[PDB]
């Protein structure tokens, strides 16, 4: 603060009256009540004056405060004073109590210490209660927290002190601050070493939780100073060696100059700092000093050695190395080195240095104590009990539960728990302290857990908190009523308890966070829950929209928008434009932005600022867009495997497990859909047969045991979805002619559609075992055939309903024949033609996407058997385009081809020429490059394109606007995975119907006519 001084005489000159330390928007103001700094012409002479007057003011203030604290209540005292002093004023009080208490124990006044401990607990009780008041500003929050982080340490020591005299060692060990009336100065004793408080203005600074290790570390650093040896704490990274040195300085009221040492530092660079320390009388620690080059350290060593020598003899002045004059030494100099053994940097220090610095090895701070402080800093009592429990759970549940990526039981989640555990404590103070924590642990971790691990956790929870019988959940009566009412509106959605629970959990995490994600395997109905929750919220007050994009389907540069290399003009980003439109307080739109594709290190890092509490999206052109209350971010990630542990902890992850929306629940859903289509009798019968084979006996679980090496690895739900698709297609003929069938006739259908959806993927050896399993369970099968006859050879005819051997249509020689371009009807092509005909003829539904992918061996006639199917298309009725994928092919290459191929439009929607319903064949679908993360970029677009029926236009002019292709069908061929070739992403698999083409047992039928 600068004030107008000497206005009457020698004007324009300015006077400094007050010091400001600003954190964020708030400030800690120490006014100089007298000792006004008159700032003369020469800058260095008034800056010296300033540093003296600051130090003069604190002394005067702290000299008044040390008198005040004894004859004033602690709540009243701490609020009045400035952070640094309040800390000093608390520590002084505490010592004067223990001294006074111990004095009485030596004179033999019994329970004198007990009386003092009772006053210290009252002191602690007030500070914990001051966290609960939630006073405004970052400064005043920091001030109260640091006080609490000290006070626990005071209470902890004094509680288990057990000394009969003041001069007994165990009390001497403890850090002791006292105001000596005789010498009129603050003195801070550690063991036998008395330093006078330097009275540097610190302000409100974050203090580290004081461990029993740290109390034994201070001592050594202290002893190191008294003997004039340097101090140098060595330990693994994250212990905060730097922080603990700084802690000791802030204790003593002395500034610490931190110097982030590196390879670039020279002996000249270092020499300047030391000369700075010795002339100023300030401490000067060096962060990561090992990372200095060994060449430099030999020179530095002589520099430290020369400083040491001078300090030992009590020399007022000494000659520094490479200095001509003798420089003034202040007695209160201390230089420290934060090093790292098991170095990530350079080899151990020189033989000269080792001598000059006394080490302190620092282990990892015991997690329990960190929690204990934090719980007290929130406004809990009986922290020591809770902290142990809280620790024991987390440490134990990490080692017992399954090692999944979205689980975090390190400090990141612990601190996240304790701020919500705290926001619960403030509102309901009367509630028991254990139950509040126990609840706050529960409601956060439950949403994260996989189905297998919920029983394990609810055990661990019960085991540590056996006093707490049962805890009531947040009822949420508004939303709970609406889900059943909402679900019944669509024909194809069933309502299970497991599923409805997983919706609620998504709505619980929706309210408190902005960046909640939704993790789960393929076809666990994440896409559905999203859609429901929003459709439920739409009906209660404000409407909710969802915007589906695929971050992987577009390049990082193209999503966020970057500077164009040509004409130097800014192209708008896809996400930026969606984000911008979405972030406007107009007609309570509350639009969610979802990122379907898998999270990777690359793309989220730009979006990392939004997910954090800042909530501002940076495009890196200077522009920063603020997130409005209404707009939110979601992620429909499967795995969450290839993401940093930091970015995970920001977002609130709900996990939807396979067992939530079971394949039973989809089947029962599909059957309910058939009754709303107007055909109740058919549905009634299909149910009695579907149930028999799929839920009553676990056919998919039994099949997967007896048959080994399935050529494509698929989940059970996928195989059931494919069953229903194929079953629909088969019966689609009987929908048009309104023909109900007998139980026998549907049974034949279902076992056909089971055999090809479930047992398709299998190879020839396994097709037999599969066919031999159907016989054991008394399904209808073709009774009579030849040797190595299988279900797969037969199909159920539409005209008359029984099993018929599929003989391929008789070949007609196509006039002039070249053996090369001659393709014939074969047994393989027909079965391929047939299954393809079932999937692609079906109308677009929830289950099907009108898309079939056929896997197979290399040159097993995949490519041919599609080209045979894609002939006999009436050019007016249906079109046929073929693109060939390859390791080179990128999403933009595939996007540009489909974008060019269907340019006809119907209002907003796009279409192929006229209205043909063009079927896009994608040969060699596996080939595109799999990156280190294990996600195929182009295929994520393919999946986006099939599922949503649209991607985002990438032409510079139009960005953040969907292009939707009203009618398209997709056939894939790919060489089956294993042996270094790429597997297709699980997410994509579900979209496609899949079956394995095989090498024929007799090519006689193929080449016999030629």
């Amino acid at each position: 603060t600068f004030e107008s001084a000497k206005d009457k005489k020698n004007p324009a000159l300015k006077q400094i009256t007050q010091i400001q330390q600003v954190i964020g928007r708030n400030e800690e103001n120490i006014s100089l009540t007298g000792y006004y700094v008159k700032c003369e012409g020469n800058i260095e002479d008034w800056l010296k004056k300033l540093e003296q007057n600051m130090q003069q003011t604190l002394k005067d203030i702290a000299s008044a405060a040390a008198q005040q604290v004894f004859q004033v209540g602690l709540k009243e005292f701490v609020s009045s004073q400035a952070s640094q002093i309040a800390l000093l004023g608390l520590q002084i009080l505490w010592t004067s109590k223990v001294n006074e208490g111990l004095e009485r124990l030596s004179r033999n006044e019994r329970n004198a210490m007990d009386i003092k401990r009772n006053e210290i607990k009252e002191h602690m009780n007030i500070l914990s209660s001051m966290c609960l008041e939630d006073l405004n500003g970052a400064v005043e929050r920091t001030k109260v927290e640091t006080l609490v982080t000290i006070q626990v340490h005071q209470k902890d020591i004094s509680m288990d002190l057990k000394c009969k005299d003041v001069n007994d060692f165990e009390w001497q060990k403890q850090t002791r601050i006292a105001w000596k009336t005789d010498i009129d100065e603050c003195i801070i004793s550690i063991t036998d070493w008395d330093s006078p408080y330097s009275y540097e203005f610190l302000g409100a600074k974050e203090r580290l939780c004081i461990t029993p290790l740290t109390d034994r570390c201070y001592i050594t650093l202290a002893q190191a100073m008294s003997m004039y040896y340097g101090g140098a704490p060595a330990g693994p990274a994250g212990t905060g060696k730097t922080e603990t040195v700084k802690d000791l300085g802030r204790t003593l009221g002395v500034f610490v100059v931190v110097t982030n040492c590196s390879d670039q530092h020279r002996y000249r660079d270092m020499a300047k700092i030391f000369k700075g320390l010795v002339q100023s009388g300030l401490w000067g620690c060096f962060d990561e000093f090992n990372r200095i080059d060994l060449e430099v350290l030999s020179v530095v060593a002589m520099q430290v050695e020369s400083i040491t020598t001078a300090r030992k003899q009590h020399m007022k002045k000494f000659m520094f190395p490479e200095e001509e004059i003798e420089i003034e030494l202040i007695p209160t100099v201390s230089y420290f080195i934060t090093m790292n053994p098991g170095y990530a940097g350079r080899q151990e220090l020189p033989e000269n240095l080792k001598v000059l610095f006394r080490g302190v090895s620092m282990m990892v701070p015991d997690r329990e104590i960190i929690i204990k402080v934090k719980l007290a800093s929130v406004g809990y009592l009986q922290i020591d009990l809770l902290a142990k429990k809280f620790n024991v759970l987390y440490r134990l549940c990490e080692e017992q539960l399954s090692k999944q990526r979205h689980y975090d039981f390190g400090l990141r989640n612990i601190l996240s728990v304790l701020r919500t555990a705290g926001n619960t404590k403030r509102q309901e103070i009367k509630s028991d302290e254990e139950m509040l924590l126990m609840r706050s642990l529960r409601d956060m971790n439950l949403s994260k857990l996989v189905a297998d691990d919920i029983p394990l956790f609810n055990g661990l929870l019960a085991d540590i908190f056996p006093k707490l019988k049962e805890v009531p959940k947040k009822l949420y009566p508004d939303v709970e009523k609406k889900i059943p009412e909402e679900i019944n509106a669509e024909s194809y959605l069933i309502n299970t308890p497991s599923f409805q629970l997983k919706i609620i959990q998504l709505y619980e995490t929706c309210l408190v966070r902005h960046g909640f994600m939704l993790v789960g395997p393929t076809g666990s109905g994440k896409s559905t829950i999203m859609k429901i929750l929003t459709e439920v919220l739409t009906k209660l007050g404000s409407p909710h929209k969802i915007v589906i994009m695929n971050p992987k389907a577009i390049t990082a540069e193209q999503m966020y928008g970057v500077k164009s290399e040509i004409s130097d003009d800014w192209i708008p980003g896809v996400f930026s434009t969606i984000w911008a439109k979405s972030n406007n307080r107009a007609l309570k739109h509350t639009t969610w932005i979802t990122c379907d594709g898998p999270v990777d290190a690359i793309w989220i890092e730009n979006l990392n600022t939004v997910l954090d509490d800042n909530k501002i999206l940076t495009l890196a052109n200077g522009e920063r867009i603020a997130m409005t209350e209404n707009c939110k971010v979601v992620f429909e990630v499967e795995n969450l495997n290839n993401a940093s542990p930091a970015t995970v902890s920001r977002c609130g992850q709900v996990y939807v497990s396979p067992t939530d929306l079971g394949y039973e629940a989809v089947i029962e859903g599909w059957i309910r859909n058939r009754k709303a289509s107007g055909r109740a009798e058919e549905s009634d019968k299909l149910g009695n047969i579907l149930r028999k084979y799929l839920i009553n006996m676990r056919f998919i679980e039994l099949q997967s045991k007896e048959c080994k090496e399935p050529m494509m690895d698929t989940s059970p739900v996928i195989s059931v979805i494919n069953i229903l698709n194929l079953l629909t297609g088969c019966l689609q003929y009987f929908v048009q002619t309104q023909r109900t069938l007998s139980e026998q006739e549907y049974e034949k259908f279902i076992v056909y559609s089971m055999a090809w959806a479930i047992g398709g993927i299998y190879e020839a050896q396994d097709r037999v075992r599969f066919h031999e399993l159907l016989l054991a369970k008394n399904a209808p099968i073709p009774q009579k055939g030849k040797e190595n006859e299988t279900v797969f050879d037969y199909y159920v005819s539409q005209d008359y309903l029984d099993w018929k051997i599929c003989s391929p249509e008789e070949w007609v020689p196509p006039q002039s024949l070249q053996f090369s371009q001659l393709l014939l009807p074969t047994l393989d092509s027909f079965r391929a033609e047939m299954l393809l005909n079932f999937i692609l003829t079906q109308p677009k539904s929830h289950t099907c996407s009108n898309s079939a992918l056929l896997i197979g061996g290399s040159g097993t006639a995949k490519t041919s058997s599609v080209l045979l199917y894609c002939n006999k298309f009436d050019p007016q009725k249906m079109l046929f385009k073929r693109t060939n994928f390859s390791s080179a092919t990128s999403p933009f290459m595939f996007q540009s081809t489909i974008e060019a191929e269907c340019d006809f439009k119907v209002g907003k929607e796009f279409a192929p020429p006229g209205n043909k319903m063009m079927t896009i064949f994608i040969d060699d679908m596996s080939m595109p490059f799999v990156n280190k993360w294990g996600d195929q970029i182009t295929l994520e677009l393919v999946r986006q394109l099939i599922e949503t029926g649209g991607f985002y236009m990438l032409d510079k002019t139009q960005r953040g606007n969907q292009r939707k292709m009203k009618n398209l069908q997709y056939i894939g061929a790919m060489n089956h995975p294993g042996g270094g070739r790429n597997d297709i992403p699980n997410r994509l698999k579900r979209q496609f119907f899949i079956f394995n083409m095989i090498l024929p047992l007799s090519i006689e039928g193929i080449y016999g006519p030629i």
């Binding site: 006039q815 002039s816 070249q818 090369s820 371009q821 290399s858 040159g859 490519t863 073929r882 693109t883 060939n884 390859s886 390791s887 081809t897 040969d923 060699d924 080939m927 060489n975 270094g980 070739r981």
Partner: protein, 96 residues
């Protein structure tokens, strides 16, 4: 590019769209005669499919690779149908 050429029979966006209609014009008189003397004016989409087939009949790729060079083993895995579509004659070490 030669892998792509061998499997597809075509390259996507190889030649200018106006240059198609000139090429296909010459192709038509052989095509109408080759297809059992059809002798009707073909459309430009049907003509393309014949020309592509014609290309593959006339265009032979001869690849001459080293088996010992580490890249060879990678190329087979990296390019499908560069190995599995063309016939492989292997050259043994010279006999006595």
């Amino acid at each position: 590019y030669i892998n792509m050429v061998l499997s597809t029979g075509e390259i996507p966006n190889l030649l200018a769209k106006d240059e198609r209609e000139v090429w296909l014009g010459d192709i038509s008189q052989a095509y109408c005669k080759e297809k059992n003397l059809g002798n009707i004016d073909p459309p430009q989409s049907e003509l393309w499919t014949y020309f592509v087939d014609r290309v593959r009949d006339n265009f032979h790729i001869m690849l001459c690779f080293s088996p010992v060079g580490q890249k060879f083993r990678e190329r087979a895995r990296k390019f499908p149908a560069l190995f599995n579509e063309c016939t492989i004659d292997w050259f043994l070490p010279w006999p006595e």
